[PDB]
Amino acid sequence: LGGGSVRFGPG
Numbered sequence: 001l002g003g004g005s006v007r008f009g010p011g
Contacts, residue, residue, distance in 0.1 A: 002011020 002008040
């Protein structure tokens, strides 16, 4: 889940 609880580099 990009842009969720944890910032995701893939997204």
